[PDB]
Amino acid sequence: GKSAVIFVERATPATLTELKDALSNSILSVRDPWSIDFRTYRCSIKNLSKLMYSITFHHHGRQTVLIKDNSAMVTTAAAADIPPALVFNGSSTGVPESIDTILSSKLSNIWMQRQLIKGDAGETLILDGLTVRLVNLFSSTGFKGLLIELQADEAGEFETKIAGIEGHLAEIRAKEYKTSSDSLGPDTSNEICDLAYQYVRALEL
């Protein structure tokens, strides 16, 4: 376990800056803005979970993880992620698109997008043995809360890293928040899948 997502509902757009300030003395480095998209899909089929979640991470390109019934599938349309072997042999045209574009245009008879919440202009703070990303979450009706994503280099130091952040949360008066460091399958091999799953759990999508 090397990651966790904390969602702060009782907050204002400013809580993000207050948290970054409280953390600033420990900032080793600041990286590039990032964003994220949380899509919720409802299945049209007449019974036989009809909800599927789709998390698109924007970090020097996009990756989308689909989460349904405690399972995840990682997909991409980003050039740097395509296995070169797949292109050479013709399995791939080498010109992919998002699984969400696919879902909405080819499978809309089965899956309907019903919600899309976003986090734009997220920030990335590099601390010692800890990466912390912050982004304000927005919905159709506006600001929804603060999202904090933690990734530790060493799993053995993780509990210590999460408690430290939680401490900074108490000092800025962010009293109520939900933490998720859950793993998809207690086999824990896929980080991006557990991370996405953690966003789902933290946001109670």
């Binding site: 049209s44 045209t93 499978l107 899956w111």
Partner: protein, 227 residues
């Protein structure tokens, strides 16, 4: 992407000849490749009114050859999921097809097999085939695939192309490209067609073939079954 293509076949006897000729026309060597494809369709039990999904990847050759050295001649002697290309295609002297694609990199959780992931989306396994061939890179994005195809069925495998090879010549262009460019693209294919006349007949599969149950809406399989 938009794919324009032509198909034709030859008996085993003309393989060396076609290989040599393609090497001369393209100026390049024949590059060995293979692909394993699984086709999926919406679960009929769910009744949804057909966009088939095709999953495709390369397999290491050592899984298809037994046991000196590996080359084009070899064709004469005939728990995360892995990465897969996922495609959905839909439909004129050439074949024109629109392809929607995304790449699957891995999975995780209780039901992470590619098969469970597809059932999760409302799809069921329909058909599976394997292609082994050589490809040539030509000018203007033109790509040639000379191959043999096998349907992998529960009760045994069968080479659909027994007795010969299927040739696929195609060019992929951006969706929404000018009518003039589409025309230009079709032109390059017709030029290859003429240039190869006498060697092999390049054409588009009929509709009876394109619709037969045995083809599963798949153009390549339809073309292989045609001749």
């Amino acid at each position: 992407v938009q794919q324009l293509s032509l198909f034709g076949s030859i008996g085993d006897d003309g393989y060396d000849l076609l290989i040599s000729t393609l090497t001369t026309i393209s100026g390049n060597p024949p590059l060995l490749y293979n692909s394993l494809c699984t086709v999926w369709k919406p679960n009929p039990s769910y009744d949804v009114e057909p966009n088939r999904i095709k999953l495709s990847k390369e397999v290491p050759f050592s899984y298809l050859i037994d046991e000196k050295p590996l080359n084009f001649r070899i064709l004469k002697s005939f728990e995360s999921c892995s990465p897969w290309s996922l495609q959905i295609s839909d439909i004129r002297s050439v074949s024109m097809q629109t392809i929607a694609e995304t790449i699957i990199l891995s999975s995780a959780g209780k039901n992470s097999s590619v098969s469970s992931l597809m059932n999760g989306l409302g799809y069921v396994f329909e058909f599976q085939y394997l292609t082994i061939g050589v490809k040539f890179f030509m000018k203007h994005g033109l790509i040639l695939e000379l191959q043999k195809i096998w349907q992998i069925e529960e009760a045994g495998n069968s080479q659909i192309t027994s007795g010969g090879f299927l040739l696929k010549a195609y060019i992929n262009v951006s969706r929404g490209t000018d009518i003039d460019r589409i025309n230009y693209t079709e032109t390059v294919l017709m030029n290859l067609k003429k240039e190869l006349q006498g060697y092999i007949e390049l054409s588009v599969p009929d509709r009876q073939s394109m619709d037969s149950r045995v083809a599963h809406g798949n153009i390549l399989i339809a073309a292989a079954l045609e001749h």
